[PDB]
Amino acid sequence: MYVAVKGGEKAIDAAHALQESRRRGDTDLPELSVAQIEQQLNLAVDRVMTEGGIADRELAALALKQASGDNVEAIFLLRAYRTTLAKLAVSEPLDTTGMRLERRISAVYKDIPGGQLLGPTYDYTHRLLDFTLLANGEAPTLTTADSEQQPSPHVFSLLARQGLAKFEEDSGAQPDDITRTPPVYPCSRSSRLQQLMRGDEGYLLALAYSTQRGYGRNHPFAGEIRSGYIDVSIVPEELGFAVNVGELLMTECEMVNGFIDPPDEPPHFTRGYGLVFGMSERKAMAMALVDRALQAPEYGEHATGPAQDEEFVLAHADNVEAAGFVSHLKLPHYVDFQAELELLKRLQQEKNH
Amino acid sequence: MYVAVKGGEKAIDAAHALQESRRRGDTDLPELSVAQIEQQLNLAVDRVMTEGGIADRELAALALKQASGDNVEAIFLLRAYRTTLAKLAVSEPLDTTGMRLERRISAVYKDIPGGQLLGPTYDYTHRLLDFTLLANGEAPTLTTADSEQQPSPHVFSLLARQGLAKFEEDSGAQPDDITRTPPVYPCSRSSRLQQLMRGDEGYLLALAYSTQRGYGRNHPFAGEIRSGYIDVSIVPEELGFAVNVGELLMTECEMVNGFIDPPDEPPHFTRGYGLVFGMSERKAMAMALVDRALQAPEYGEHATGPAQDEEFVLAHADNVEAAGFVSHLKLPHYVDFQAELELLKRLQQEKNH
Amino acid sequence: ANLSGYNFAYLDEQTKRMIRRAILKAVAIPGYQVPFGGREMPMPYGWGTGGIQLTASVIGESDVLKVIDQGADDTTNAVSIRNFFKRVTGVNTTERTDDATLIQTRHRIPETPLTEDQIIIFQVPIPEPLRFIEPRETETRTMHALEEYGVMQVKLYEDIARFGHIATTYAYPVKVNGRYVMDPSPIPKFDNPKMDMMPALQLFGAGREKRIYAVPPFTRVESLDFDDHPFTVQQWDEPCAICGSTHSYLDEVVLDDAGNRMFVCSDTDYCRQQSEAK
Amino acid sequence: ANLSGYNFAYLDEQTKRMIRRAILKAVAIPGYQVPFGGREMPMPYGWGTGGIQLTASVIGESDVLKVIDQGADDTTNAVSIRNFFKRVTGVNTTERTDDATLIQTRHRIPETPLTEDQIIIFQVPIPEPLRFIEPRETETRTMHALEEYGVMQVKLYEDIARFGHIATTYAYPVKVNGRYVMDPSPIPKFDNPKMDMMPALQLFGAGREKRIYAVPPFTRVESLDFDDHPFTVQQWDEPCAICGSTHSYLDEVVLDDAGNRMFVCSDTDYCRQQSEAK
Amino acid sequence: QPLLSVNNLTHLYAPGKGFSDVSFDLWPGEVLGIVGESGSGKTTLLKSISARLTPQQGEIHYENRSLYAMSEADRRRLLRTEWGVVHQHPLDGLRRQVSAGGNIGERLMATGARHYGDIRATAQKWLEEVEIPANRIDDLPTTFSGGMQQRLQIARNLVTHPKLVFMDEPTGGLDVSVQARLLDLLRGLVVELNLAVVIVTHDLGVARLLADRLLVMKQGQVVESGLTDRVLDDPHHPYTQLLVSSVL
Amino acid sequence: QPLLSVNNLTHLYAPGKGFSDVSFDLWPGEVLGIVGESGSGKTTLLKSISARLTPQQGEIHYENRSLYAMSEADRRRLLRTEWGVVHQHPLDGLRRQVSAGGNIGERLMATGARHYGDIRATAQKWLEEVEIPANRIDDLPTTFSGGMQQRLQIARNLVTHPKLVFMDEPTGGLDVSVQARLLDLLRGLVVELNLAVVIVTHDLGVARLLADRLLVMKQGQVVESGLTDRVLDDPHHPYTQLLVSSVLQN
Ligand SMILES: Nc1ncnc2c1ncn2[C@@H]1O[C@H](COP(=O)(O)OP(=O)(O)OP(=O)(O)O)[C@@H](O)[C@H]1O
Ligand SMILES: Nc1ncnc2c1ncn2[C@@H]1O[C@H](COP(=O)(O)OP(=O)(O)OP(=O)(O)O)[C@@H](O)[C@H]1O
Ligand SMILES: O=P(O)(O)OC[C@H]1O[C@@H]2OP(=O)(O)O[C@@H]2[C@@H]1O
Ligand SMILES: O=P(O)(O)OC[C@H]1O[C@@H]2OP(=O)(O)O[C@@H]2[C@@H]1O
Ligand SMILES: [Mg+2]
Ligand SMILES: [Mg+2]
Ligand SMILES: [Zn+2]
Ligand SMILES: [Zn+2]
Ligand SMILES: [Zn+2]
Ligand SMILES: [Zn+2]
């Protein structure tokens, strides 16, 4: 007859060893360092920080190395690590006006105060595979202009001064924190922005692309995309006064969106907002576009696309949840499958009879 | 007065140099090699091959290096390179029964003929950041079992032999090739599968997750997930007989899906199919789930979720298109913005009058 | 003992306290899904995070932990969860349902009847029994609140009309304390009767969906059905090929491509208990 | 000459031939969006791939290529496209509309009137003028086929009723040859009249959407409007601050945070032509 | 005590759109018809008195309990067990994806029915009582005609023998024969089961044959009230005179 | 020649569901009412003869041209310019997101109208002709009542003065006064503009006052046909006798 044996634990251990060996790869090649990933794969690091929830470049690069380059796995690793960290403080609200700029562009005006700073970007590159990278090369010597940074007012501050757009006013409302309480639909805009920042880049990009193609359009213009170093400050209880704890490289995107004509005020442009860690800006743009799409209840807009369906967008945006639940089908399901089989075999035997 | 000056070209060149320097990063660290990325970041390479459309590990790793780890940019680089390559042959249809397995699991039965081969996987790992990877380590010594590969029948062949599922029959229909002609909606299942394989992992994962959560459910079970080396063969015209040109590492996912009760045949399970390059399997699972969702017209299913909306899913699935069109907002739009402004300024005056 | 560098049971005291308050609220409101601020675990969402959190919040040094998946202690994920709990708590573990004080289970209730002071913790993918009828939480929350379960009865009626049977075979909805329609987790219809008037506390954890619900001991759990279509549990024409039991839930193991198969107990501990007794 | 290692104009002969057939079909069916098997270019989709493909398919060694974006030759993307074409074709380039044989443009028609044997190639994001009314191609294809443009007229009527004006300010729909409603690309209303009975061939390329359409020389292009709400072009209370023209499309340049701004010609070549003439 | 008492009920979308200052009483076993020019607020009043629209002013008592002072659960229970509501559009009171048998049996199961065979038999009987064949029980209402759908929504809201049934143009889309068959059914239920009916209709013949009392609405204001026979044969308000004169 | 000729038209979803072997003729200036028990196929026949449903058998000629032998574009043009179609559900022949003025003016612009002011004036006039106030022109039909929506769909399909108008229960949901106001309008259009009408209704009074000829359908079969007065006052088929007897005498 048959006797049951124990095979689960050793199979698990062998599978983990196989995965670790595959991660190391050929041993003749030197092992990758987290520093190399942080420096040279910086955009993947940016995505992993933004979605995993920690603005620590080294940790995100470590997760990428551990995940064998899998962005979803690295993001989940970073989020799991976040769970183990004590919250020491809450930052004072970020002031993007103080950003030291690496890149500042505006699509709405040819030239603006402070100028069109392209900065480090792949924009306008010819996407031809560069086979010289197959071998070691020499980094180019950078041209140097004047060192001063020109006054860079937010383009939306220029639009609002003309009455074309409305200033974003602070009423002192306490932001919702979906990391402490589960989201409740309909969610506040603070909760929506927090979720979108953690949301999958591809999902939100597809939703925004759909909005551009008529599935809940909002007539977007890139009013300003700002990337640079923004200082973080906290008010520790031991001292009672603000202390600057460092700077973070972040990208801010502001979208002008289709004007509205309210009954009691002049017609004005609407707007969307995106904010991400690092330089990767398409995530911020998609965040702004989906934020504007989800603003439909505020503006009484009739939904014409899934991007405006708040629950559908947000409940499936976090790739931690989505990847976990899709991959969970790999788990043994033979008890549930036996139940489905037990019924089908009967409905097959009752139809034939 | 003011005079116009030329600044576009030099700004572009300086921006490209800045991006290249940032890609190189700190020069004290050795430059990353494409071989290291291919070996140790293999899952990112898998995604880039699958979505970029070329099953060349070195090219995908080169694109990742060139893209500073940006998966979207690397995928677009690989697709652009694909455009420059002559098509030398069309492979004979792949036979996954001949796959040399690295990993074979089934969620529907506890044990199957050939067994549950976990293989290299992160499944069942505790996602705790491994800080030992911050320094060089030693790869584990792999345990060795018997070298023979056990007969591994497809689980769906076991289900179909019992009448629980239907064999996928070949009618000789010529597959649609959306790389040669633009997709026409409604698309054939061959076109749908081709597009989904090229589709964004995050978008399709979110759609599949939504289907699991009731937005167009199809009651999925992972009937079998197979990863391994499959031989590619072509029938060159110079010889007239099949020649084996090599092997490709690929992952195949077969999903059992909710049974149906056709009027004239016994009730049976439906199915979905996913196939990807490399080992990354969540893309294949999402592909299978969305394939089943898009099978609604065949089964006369009443759509209850966006995942079943064929045009919405497919038109926005390709992240080449989506990323390009979202990023295009960064382009100067001041002519169009001036038009919108010219109108809004007149509407403001008329409302105030 | 715990010698892993993490807090006992890997949860910070604030998260444990919040989950404990949620557990008490769920006990006081049987069948109601209590939202809780679930955290991301070392296991991916959809791989038992809710059950892990509940066990971590309830478990103590003196508890004997039993972890089973598909009814088996040696299942991959059950092994992973048990090893994690051994690492971060050091508690004693057992494969015997009788000797367990805490049972964390995925898709099976043990064949061995549970006793007083035992807590069984279920891992739940979808805490909402009405989700597959109404995917949106905004509607199901109000349906729960106003006891509007008319959509489930219609679903059952239509299933009978279309097939002659109720299509649902696992995660079969059950009315709790005469009020709340509840999802018992993806356990088979075979196990649902065990829930009725059980002398053990039942806890249900949906980590990804951020819900916790519970059934107190000796609480009425009635599977939704009709008088002329009474609740019928799964049945097999064969006994277990190892122990010969005819009263256990059976898993089908395919032995070859020729179609030879054997049915064996999913509850491996019960199978061993029967086999040893001969 | 071409010394880049690629085929002349970077396109393989099969792709060029397919695009050429599509161009001929579009010319024979003015206003109709001809699907074509567009390929991925070194530029991202949505950054002018359709126009690049059309130019590559039509361009020759003897052509003088003019590339303008927002009406300016020095615009970033225009510079990139012109440099790519210089690399892969080696053709002569010019900033003068009069001296150009091929003009690839994004969002502007040059102020200088076009002449015979000139081809102007437009870059089109959305080749379907009815897309923002009906996002689905499955419906718009049939709307084009059955000449059912009632949804556009209703849109214009509702825009007038709500605002008193037609909200569309660029990419303004135009009827071509009395039959086909067409999107002229995101050129402003200012430029639409230039399309009517033009002595130059107009080609429109939507690479991402995989469409090509064309307007032959001396073809009727009529912007949709009403008699009591006639088509009115953009107007500015100021002339160009550099050349003093009152007849050119103007771009607003913000000089400081204090709100000082100047309006200058978007068509930089026309601005230079006027300034030199004094 | 009156079964349903309405006092100074008001709900206006805009001046002249809706209803205002509407008061009346309804005892068991009598029918209160409502007539008026199209857009007079009859539908708004019907929704307000059926717990489907919170009034801006006034009050509604049902069995000595304020209708809107109770919890939403109690109002839902009333609309689920002992209150019928026939809508002007038949599909509003129907489930498109649920067969006719399911639509009828939802109401039966809400009342405690748990025997599939008896539910199916009662659904077939009622489908036949409203002149729909029994073989259509498994068919979805989308495949039914407008009259068939309306007669399905009547059967759905009368299968539970509710105490109070609100109707909006119930006879619309029904031929004269099935119309009279549905009026006779209502009269039988009223006389036997003591059912109360509040019906909004334009066909004055149906009100005369069915409505015990009649109300007349114009510009959202109740202009005339009293017995159906007195109002129809001896109208006082000019609009009532015009409406009766218009009778073909 | 008849304006609309139907020969052996048939379309059945299942035996007894739909219509079969239906033939008749319609000349300009006359109204052809259709009556029968609910579910007799009146709506199916109306859709089939209005180019909305391809018949399984038979033929339809319009001005010596087979209705379904022409291209889809020609049929769409007919339904867009010179053919009115009032649906049993008012919202079917209305645009929810488009105001009443827009709904009425779509039909005017399809006929060549390109003056916004004249379109608006005509829409206001017709809103008043069907008893809806002019100030509701900018309001969406979703905010209208059922009778208001039905009277909007009549105004929408009569603003262009079409030659042939198909109606399905046009009088449903309308009070007697506005019903008679809408019957008088139809009579005026028919006598003056020579409009042809094919109306499906259950109120025999409307058919008597309007329908020049009458058809009776039962189980998808045309049982009785001829003049409205003869059919109503001197019925032959038993079902017609039952239907006339059921009439609620006042
Ligand atoms: N949401 C709304 N917004 C604005 N006005 C509305 C709204 N709903 C209804 N109205 C208006 O309120 C008035 C009352 O409409 P209601 O549907 O109650 O009329 P009714 O008498 O039942 O109609 P009928 O007998 O013609 O079906 C009408 O003018 C209607 O247009
Ligand atoms: N899609 C369909 N599938 C099956 N049967 C259908 C379908 N559509 C209609 N029927 C049936 O065909 C018959 C004709 O219905 P139809 O709507 O034409 O009736 P009618 O005489 O116009 O109705 P009424 O006067 O009550 O509105 C009815 O039995 C209807 O149930
Ligand atoms: O959300 P989590 O992390 O607590 O996972 C709960 C359950 O969801 C998945 O679906 P499953 O029931 O097949 O088993 C898995 C898992 O046990
Ligand atoms: O699809 P492609 O690649 O041919 O890009 C066509 C056009 O789409 C984008 O939108 P735009 O009009 O603002 O300018 C861009 C570009 O010129
Ligand atoms: Mg009404
Ligand atoms: Mg009908
Ligand atoms: Zn599962
Ligand atoms: Zn654009
Ligand atoms: Zn056993
Ligand atoms: Zn100038």
**Which H, E and C letters describe chain E, residue by residue?**
CCCEEEEEEEEEEECCEEEEEEEEEECCCCEEEEEECCCCCHHHHHHHHCCCCCCCEEEEEECCEECCCCCHHHHHHHHHHCEEEECCCHHHHCCCCCCHHHHHHHHHHHCCCCCHHHHHHHHHHHHHHCCCCHHHCCCCHHHCCHHHHHHHHHHHHHCCCCCEEEEECCCCCCCHHHHHHHHHHHHHHHHHHCCEEEEECCCHHHHHHHCCEEEEEECCEEEEEEEHHHHHHCCCCHHHHHHHHHCC
Write down the catalytic residue from C38, C50, C207, C240. C240
User: Which residues sit opposite F217 in a β-bridge?
Assistant: F36, F222
**Rounded CA gap, C2 and A80, in Å?**
20
State the residue for tokens 């983990």. Answer: A16
Q: How far does chain D reach from its first CA to its final CA, in angstroms?
A: 38
C-alpha distances out from residue A23 to A73, B37, C42, E73, F82, Å: 13, 10, 19, 58, 72
Pick from A7, A84, A321: CB nearest C45: A321
Cβ B268 vs Cβ B286: under 8 Å: no
Tokens of C142: 């109000």
Q: Could you confirm whether C240 is annotated as catalytic? A: yes
Given a contact cutoff of 8 angstroms between Cβ atoms, the answer to whether E119 and C157 are in contact is yes
Phi, psi of A301 (to 5 degrees): -90, 140
**Closest residue by Cα to residue E246 from F131, D264, A135:** F131
Q: How far is it, in rounded angstroms, from Cα F100 to Cα F106?
A: 10
E41 is in an annotated binding site: yes
Ligand 1 centroid–CA E88 distance in Å is 12
Give the neighbor-by-neighbor strand order of the sheet with B243-260.
Answer: B100-105, B221-234, B243-260, B268-277
Chain A residues close to D80, C-beta within 8 Å:
124-126
Q: Is the CB of E8 under 6 A from ligand 2?
A: no
Is there contact between B and A if contact means ≥3 C-beta pairs under 8 Å? yes
Do D166 and D160 form a contact (C-beta atoms < 8 A)?
yes
Q: How far is CA A299 from the centre of its chain?
A: 25
Closest-lying ligand to the alpha carbon of C246? 9
Could you tell me which residues come within 8 angstroms of residue A64 by beta carbon, excluding any fewer than 6 positions away?
A: A37, A41, A44, A45, A48, A70, A71, A74, B41, B69
How far apart are the C-alpha atoms of A2 and F185, rounded to whole Å?
A: 89
In whole angstroms, how far apart are CA C179 and each of C30, C148, C174, C195, C221?
A: 9, 11, 10, 16, 10
In degrees and rounded to multiples of 5, residue C155 shows phi and psi of: -60, -45
- The encoded tokens of residue D265 equal 């010609």
For B135-165, give the DSSP string: S---PPPPP----PPPP---HHHHHHHTTSB
Q: Which of A125, A151, A213 sits opposite D257 (nearest CB)?
A: A151
D261's CB contacts (< 8 A; 6+ apart) are: D252, D253, D254, D255
d(CA E112, CA A120): 70
Measuring from atom 28 of ligand 1, which residue has the nearest CA? Answer: E39
Q: How far apart are CA F16 and CA D18, in angstroms?
A: 54
Q: Report helix, strand or coil for D55.
A: helix
Residue B8 has its nearest CB partner, among D74, D169, D186, at D74
- Which residues in chain B are closer than 8 Å to C255, comparing Cβ atoms? 113
- The reply, when asked if residue F128 is annotated as ligand binding, is no
Sign of CA dihedral D273, D275, D276, D278: positive
In sequence order, what are the beta bridge partners of F226? F214
Q: How big, in percent rounded to 5, are the helix, strand and coil portions of chain C?
A: 30, 20, 50
Interface test with A, best of D211, D254, D255, D256 (most A CBs within 10 A): D254
D31 is catalytic: yes
Q: Which of D51, D71, D205, D271 is catalytic?
A: D271
| CA–CA–CA angle F7, F10, F12 (5° rounding) | 170
Residue F201 beta carbon below 6 angstroms from any ligand 2 atom: no
Selecting among D31, D51, D71, D207, the annotated active-site residue is D31
Nearest to B62 by CA among A124, A128, A75: A128
Task: Determine which one of D46, D243, D244, D259 is catalytic.
Answer: D243
- D107-146 core/surface letters (b: 16 or more CB in 10 A; e: else): bbbbbeebeeebbbbbbbbbbbbbbbbbbbbeebbebbeb
- For B254, which DSSP code? E
Contact D121, D115 (CB under 8 A): no
Q: Is C51 a catalytic residue?
A: no
Q: What is the resolution of this structure in A?
A: 2.0
- What are the structure tokens assigned to B148, written together? 């023979």
Pairwise CA distance, residues B169 & B160, whole Å? 12
F100 and F142 in contact (C-beta within 8 Å)? no
Contacts 24+ apart (CB under 8 A), F185-189: F185/F129, F185/F130, F185/F158, F186/F31, F186/F210, F189/F158, F189/F161
D227/F114 Cβ within 8 A:
yes
Nearest to B49 by CA among B71, B33, B70: B71
Residue of B nearest to D124 (CA): B325
State how far Cα C25 lies from the chain centre: 19
Is E33 annotated as belonging to a binding site?
no
Single-letter amino acid code for the residue at F184: D
Continuous H helices in chain B: 8-24, 34-40, 42-52, 57-66, 71-83, 155-161, 189-198, 201-212, 282-294, 296-299, 310-315, 319-327, 334-352
List chain F residues with CB under 8 Å of D225: 114
Q: How many CA atoms lie within 13 A of B276 on its CB side?
A: 34
Q: Amino acid identity, residue F195?
A: L
Distances, alpha carbon D233 to alpha carbons C181, C201, D184, F116, in Å: 64, 76, 15, 19
- How far apart, in Å, do the first and last CA atoms of chain F sit? 41
Residues making up chain F, counted from first to last? 250
Assess whether C259 carries a catalytic annotation.
Answer: no
Task: Tell me the best of F136, F143, F174 to mutate to test the pocket of ligand 1, counting ligand atoms within 8 Å of each CB and taking the most.
Answer: F143
The best mutation among D39, D69, D123 to test binding of ligand 4, ranked by most ligand atoms within 8 Å of the C-beta, falls on D123
Asked whether the beta carbons of residue F99 and residue D146 sit closer than 8 angstroms, the reply is no
Backbone angles phi, psi at F25, to 5 degrees: -135, 145
In terms of C-beta density within 10 A (0-12 exposed, 13-18 middle, 19 or more buried), how is residue F221 classed? Answer: middle
- D271 catalytic per annotation: yes
Neighbours of B268 (CB within 10 A): 19
Q: What is the 3-state secondary structure (H, E, C) of A158-224?
A: HHHHCCCECCCCCCCCCCCCCCCCCCCCCCCHHHHHHHHHHCCHHHHHHHHHHHHCCCCCCCCEEEE
- Catalytically annotated residue among D50, D51, D207, D265: D265
Which position has the token pair 């584990």?
B140
CA-to-CA separations, C87 to C8, C24, E14, in angstroms, rounded: 9, 27, 69
| Helices B71-83 & B57-66 angle (0-180, nearest 10) | 120
Residue numbers of D between 135 and 194 with CB closer than 8 Å to F: 145-148, 150, 153-154, 157-158, 160-161
Q: How far, in Å, are A40, B69, B77, F197 from residue B34 at the CA level?
A: 12, 12, 15, 77
Domain limits for position F99? 1-250
In the PDB record, what is the listed experimental method?
A: cryo-EM
Is residue D21 packed enough to be buried (19+ CB in 10 Å), middle (13-18) or exposed (0-12)?
middle
Distance CA F2, CA E247 (A): 35
Q: Which residues of F109-148 are buried (b: 16+ CB within 10 A; e: fewer)?
A: bbeebbebeebbebbbebbebbbbebebbebbbeebbbbb
Please give the C-alpha separations between residue C86 and each of C45, C53, C268, E72, in angstroms, as whole numbers.
Answer: 21, 14, 21, 49
B66: helix, strand or coil: helix
Kindly give the number of the ligand 1 atom that is closest to the alpha carbon of E88: 27
Q: Taking CB atoms and an 8 Å limit, are F73 and D145 in contact across chains? A: yes
- Which value, in Å, is the radius of gyration of the alpha carbons in chain F? 18
- The answer, yes or no, to whether E and C have at least 3 beta-carbon pairs within 8 Å is yes
- Facing residues of F222 across strands? F217
**Which of E98, E117, E138 has the CB atom closest to C154's CB atom?**
E98
Distance C122 CA to ligand 9 centre (A): 23
**How far apart (Å, rounded) are the C-alpha atoms in residues B220 and B254?**
10
Residues B220 and B258: their CA atoms lie apart, in Å, by 7
* Residues of chain F neighbouring D226 (CB-CB closer than 8 A): 114-116
In which residue are the tokens 């229909």 written? B173
Residue F94 gets which letter from DSSP?
S
Residues of D in contact with B86 (CB under 8 A): 12
Helix, strand, coil percentages, rounded to 5, for chain F: 40, 25, 35
Residue B331 CA: which ligand 4 atom is closest? 13
Q: Which residues of F touch D (CB under 8 A)?
A: 72-73, 76-77, 80, 95, 98-99, 101-102, 105-106, 109-110, 114-117, 119-120, 138
For the packed helices E100-110 and E146-158, what is the interaxial angle rounded to 10 degrees?
Answer: 20
- Spatial contact of B81 and B93, defined as CB atoms under 8 Å apart: no
Q: What is the Cα–Cα distance from E222 to E207, expressed in whole angstroms? A: 17
How many residues are recorded in chain A? 353
> What is the DSSP pairing of strand D64-69 with strand D102-106?
parallel
Say which amino acid occupies B299: Y
- Chain C partners of A7 at a C-beta cutoff of 8 Å? 74
Kindly report the nearest CA distance between residue A95 and chain B, in angstroms. 23
| F167: three-class secondary structure by DSSP | strand
What DSSP assignment string belongs to A17-39? HHHHHHHH--TTSPPPPHHHHHH
Pairwise CA distance, residues F124 & E245, whole Å: 28
> Which two tokens mark D89?
């074709």
Residue A329, CB half-sphere, CA atoms under 13 Å: how many? 29
Q: Which residues of D touch B13 (CB under 8 A)?
A: none
Structure tokens at E147: 């009259």
Residue E171, annotated as binding a ligand? no
Check whether F37 is labelled as a binding-site residue: yes
Is B330 near ligand 4, meaning CB less than 6 Å away? no
Contact of C5 with chain E, judged by CB distance below 8 Å, is answered with: no
Tell me, in angstroms, the distance from the centre of ligand 10 to residue A257's CA.
Answer: 29
Element housing C273 (H / E): helix C268-277
The count of structural domains within chain E is 1
Please identify which of the residues D46, D51, D240, D259 carries the catalytic annotation. D240
CA–centroid distance, A16 to ligand 7, in Å, is: 23
Q: DSSP letter at B296? A: H
Closest ligand 2 atom to Cα of F40: 21
Nearest to E197 by CA among E175, E182, E219: E182
**What count of other Cβ atoms lies within 10 Å of the Cβ of residue F151?**
28
**Nearest Cα residue to atom 11 of ligand 3:** C125
Any idea how long chain C is?
278
DSSP string of C40-107, one letter each residue = --SSPTTSSHHHHHHHHHH--TT-EEEEEETTBTTSHHHHHHHHHHHHHH--EE-S-TTT-SEEEEES
| Among candidates D79, D135, D257 on the partner chain, residue whose Cβ is nearest the Cβ of A215 | D135
First to last CA, chain C: 38
Which residues make beta-bridge pairs with F221?
Answer: F218
F23 close to F58: Cβ distance less than 8 angstroms: yes
Distance from C-alpha of B167 to C-alpha of B188, rounded to nearest angstrom = 19
**Domain range for residue C98?**
1-278
Peptide bond connecting C44 to the previous residue in cis, omega within 30 degrees of 0 = no
Q: What is the largest CA-CA distance in chain F?
A: 55
What total of structural domains would you count in chain D?
1
Q: How far is CA D202 from the centre of its chain?
A: 8
| Cβ within 8 Å of residue E97, ≥6 positions away | B302, E140
- Is residue F41 part of an annotated ligand binding site? yes
Who contacts F249 (Cβ-Cβ below 8 Å, separation ≥6)? none
